[PDB]
Ligand binder design. Structure first.
Ligand SMILES: [Mg+2]
Ligand SMILES: [Mg+2]
Ligand SMILES: [Mg+2]
Ligand SMILES: [Mg+2]
Ligand SMILES: [Mg+2]
Ligand SMILES: [Mg+2]
Ligand SMILES: [Mg+2]
Ligand SMILES: [Mg+2]
Ligand SMILES: [Mg+2]
Ligand SMILES: [Mg+2]
Ligand SMILES: [Mg+2]
Ligand SMILES: [Mg+2]
Ligand SMILES: [Mg+2]
Ligand SMILES: [Mg+2]
Ligand SMILES: [Mg+2]
Ligand SMILES: [Mg+2]
Ligand SMILES: [Mg+2]
Ligand SMILES: [Mg+2]
Ligand SMILES: [Mg+2]
Ligand SMILES: [Mg+2]
Ligand SMILES: [Mg+2]
Ligand SMILES: [Mg+2]
Ligand SMILES: [Mg+2]
Ligand SMILES: [Mg+2]
Ligand SMILES: [Mg+2]
Ligand SMILES: [Mg+2]
Ligand SMILES: [Mg+2]
Ligand SMILES: [Mg+2]
Ligand SMILES: [Mg+2]
Ligand SMILES: [Mg+2]
Ligand SMILES: [Mg+2]
Ligand SMILES: [Mg+2]
Ligand SMILES: [Mg+2]
Ligand SMILES: [Mg+2]
Ligand SMILES: [Mg+2]
Ligand SMILES: [Mg+2]
Ligand SMILES: [Mg+2]
Ligand SMILES: [Mg+2]
Ligand SMILES: [Mg+2]
Ligand SMILES: [Mg+2]
Ligand SMILES: [Mg+2]
Ligand SMILES: [Mg+2]
Ligand SMILES: [Mg+2]
Lengths: 142, 103, 55, 110, 117
RNA sequence: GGGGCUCAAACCACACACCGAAGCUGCGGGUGUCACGGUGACGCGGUAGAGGAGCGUUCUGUAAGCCUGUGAAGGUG
RNA sequence: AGGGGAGUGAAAUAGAACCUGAAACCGUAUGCGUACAAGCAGUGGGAGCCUACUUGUUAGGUGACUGCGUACCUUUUGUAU
């Protein structure tokens, strides 16, 4: 009698669609990270990808509380001396709405080959529609 | 028909006609034993949860053999402190065959 | 300047992965049936059906 | 089948001679002789004689046609090496190693 | 009575080089490097016989938590209800029923919910 | 520590629940000391260092024996 | 030069650099893994594949993925240093 383990070949993956249309960035993102990892399933094992597929439709309408709309800053270094570059929440929504939700969720996942595989099941769009009507996602709240 | 029994400080999920290794028992080989410590018995779609223990249940098993597990090997090393010990271990077990489960 | 740790078996064999040799382009003298190098005179003295060195 | 031919104490390094051996492994003895006759390397001169003796061995000792053979096995081993002295500057001496090798080729009609 | 160490020293070396089978590079073919790898592997094995009991208990808890919330209850509320009423089944068996015997797990959870806790 | 956090995932009080060590309990084994005649009870991290018990190698006696070309020592699984 | 046969021999992988013939080191052949992945190279868990046969609660080879994890000796108050 050994403990059950999930085989990467016979896992079940469903599709969900989430509306980010008045949801806090960090509290929407924790529910996404749970579904992406599979923590909501009794068959969860730490070393296989047993999560679900998540689709986010209204990416640009996510919001932050307080003065974080202006003072929240995103940094990245280009690799050349003095190459630190920055941008804030107002500018990033105008430039790339999807990069806001993708960046939040990506930091809530493990940083290893399996973590990058959990990240490939998240689709983020900015319109009211997605191109995944064939896969027939079902609405998910929060 | 499966049941949950306690033996050797551990709990085992058991169905009839099953070979399993448990902690050492003081019973001669080829003899029969009973477990009067049953916490859950499930029959098809019906499940009988055990308030402390299920009242009126029993599981009968026959002792098959005795033996020792594979050797685990112990080393105790403290670096640059001029200390090293070493040991070996094989753990005794008892193999039983489950011959009956009644509710 | 000299190494600080000796290289491994795999580390030097990877460097030699670009050390393989290529094969020459040969051709057959149609009139005779003698294999020679492409665009060179045959080891007998024929080029494009013409004796050129009379051995 | 599987006729062999060995040359021991060939006066060349094993590393140098293994480049040529990798060119003829698996080919037909007809298209493998032309590859060695036109090679610029020196180990191809030496290995062209070992291959042509394994073919003759497969003829006289076994009665087999050349058109059916192929180079099934070829490998190069290391041999006894000579040690010499090379005088360097400021009175230092160095160890020179003159390496050799053993070349083995096998042909088979199967 | 002069003693030569040739036979006994080799016999002692080959015991270490047999335990270093499968190690990368010099760790499996030179005695000096292989000796340290065989000792270090023993240190890890002793330590990891304790983590094995920690790692599996965490895994069972993560599965009872996921299965209890399917029935509308957190893990910490389920343990309180089970302890309050009667149930003394392990986390190893509770995790197994969560995956395979989902009907029995629901019956257990409804017993813990009915205990007002 | 990072993501991220604003009727908080911050701070101040109170309440119940859970996680969490090689700690404690459970089951199975091995040892040291003491007592009674195998049982009990208390222990068993360790450098310098003290004390106790052993393995293996060469040679001598037991041995003018015993094993061995129907295969010794050695080598390799 | 060196080999392939044939012959002598109980035995030529006893062939004259000749009893046995280990390790470092160098190769050929088969099986599995490896080209989006960061670190003392192991250890705990673990799928898939290959082989053998007692045909899967088995044995052998490999170890995708994942939790923990900064060699040894010496000298020191103290070293991944
Ligand atoms: Mg040290
Ligand atoms: Mg270097
Ligand atoms: Mg240095
Ligand atoms: Mg290689
Ligand atoms: Mg090169
Ligand atoms: Mg001079
Ligand atoms: Mg050199
Ligand atoms: Mg390995
Ligand atoms: Mg080896
Ligand atoms: Mg040594
Ligand atoms: Mg409040
Ligand atoms: Mg514990
Ligand atoms: Mg203790
Ligand atoms: Mg005890
Ligand atoms: Mg002690
Ligand atoms: Mg203690
Ligand atoms: Mg004697
Ligand atoms: Mg024999
Ligand atoms: Mg002797
Ligand atoms: Mg022998
Ligand atoms: Mg032996
Ligand atoms: Mg021999
Ligand atoms: Mg001999
Ligand atoms: Mg010799
Ligand atoms: Mg010899
Ligand atoms: Mg003799
Ligand atoms: Mg060798
Ligand atoms: Mg290979
Ligand atoms: Mg990438
Ligand atoms: Mg890859
Ligand atoms: Mg690297
Ligand atoms: Mg990193
Ligand atoms: Mg690195
Ligand atoms: Mg394992
Ligand atoms: Mg196997
Ligand atoms: Mg592993
Ligand atoms: Mg690992
Ligand atoms: Mg680590
Ligand atoms: Mg030193
Ligand atoms: Mg000093
Ligand atoms: Mg100092
Ligand atoms: Mg330190
Ligand atoms: Mg160092």
């Amino acid at each position: 009698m050994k403990t059950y383990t999930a085989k990467p070949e016979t896992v079940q993956r469903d599709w969900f669609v989430v509306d980010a249309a008045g949801q806090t960035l960090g509290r929407l993102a924790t529910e996404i990270a749970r579904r992406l990892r599979g923590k909501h399933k009794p068959e969860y094992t730490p070393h296989v990808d047993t999560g679900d597929y998540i689709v986010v439709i209204n990416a640009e309408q996510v919001r932050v509380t307080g003065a974080k709309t202006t003072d929240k800053m995103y940094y990245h270094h280009s690799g050349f001396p003095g190459g630190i570059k920055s941008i804030n929440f107002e500018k990033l929504i105008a430039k790339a709405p999807e990069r806001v939700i993708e960046t939040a969720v990506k930091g809530m996942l493990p940083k290893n080959p399996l973590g990058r595989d959990m990240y490939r099941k998240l689709k983020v769009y900015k319109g009211a529609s997605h191109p995944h009507t064939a896969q027939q996602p079902q609405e998910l709240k929060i | 028909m499966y049941a949950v029994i306690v033996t050797g400080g551990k709990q085992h999920k058991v169905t009839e006609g099953e070979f399993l290794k448990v902690e050492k028992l003081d019973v001669a080989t080829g003899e029969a034993i009973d477990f009067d410590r049953v916490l859950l018995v499930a029959n098809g779609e019906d499940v009988k949860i055990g308030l402390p223990v299920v009242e009126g249940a029993k599981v009968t098993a026959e002792v098959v053999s005795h033996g020792r597990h594979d050797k685990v090997r112990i080393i105790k090393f403290r670096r640059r402190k001029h200390h090293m010990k070493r040991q070996g271990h094989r753990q005794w077990f008892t193999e039983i065959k489950i011959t009956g489960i009644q509710a | 300047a000299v190494q600080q740790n000796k290289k491994s078996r795999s580390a030097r064999d990877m460097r030699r992965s670009h050390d393989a040799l290529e094969s020459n382009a040969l051709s057959v003298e149609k009139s005779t049936g003698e294999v020679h190098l492409r665009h060179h005179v045959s080891p007998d003295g024929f080029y494009r059906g013409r004796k050129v060195v009379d051995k | 089948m599987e006729v062999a031919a060995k040359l021991s104490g060939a006066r060349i390094s094993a590393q140098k001679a293994r480049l040529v051996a990798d060119q003829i492994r698996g080919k037909k003895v007809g298209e493998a002789l032309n590859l060695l006759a036109f090679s610029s390397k020196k180990a191809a001169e030496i290995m062209k004689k070992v291959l042509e003796s394994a073919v003759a061995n497969a003829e006289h000792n076994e009665g087999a046609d050349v058109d059916d053979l192929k180079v099934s096995t070829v490998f190069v081993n290391e041999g006894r090496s000579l040690k010499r002295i090379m005088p360097r500057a400021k009175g230092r001496a160095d160890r020179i190693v003159k390496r050799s090798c053993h070349i083995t080729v096998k042909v088979a009609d199967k | 009575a002069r003693v030569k160490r040739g036979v006994i020293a080799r016999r002692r070396h080959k015991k270490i080089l047999k335990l270093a089978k499968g190690y990368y590079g010099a760790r499996s073919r030179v005695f000096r490097v292989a000796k340290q790898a065989v000792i270090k592997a023993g240190q890890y094995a002793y330590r990891d016989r304790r983590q094995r009991k920690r790692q599996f208990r965490a895994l069972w808890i993560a599965r009872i938590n996921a299965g209890a919330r399917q029935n509308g209850l957190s893990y910490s509320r389920l343990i309180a209800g089970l302890k309050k009423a009667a149930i003394e089944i392990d986390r190893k068996v509770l995790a197994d029923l969560a995956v395979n015997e989902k009907a029995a797990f629901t019956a257990i959870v409804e017993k813990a919910k009915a205990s007002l806790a």
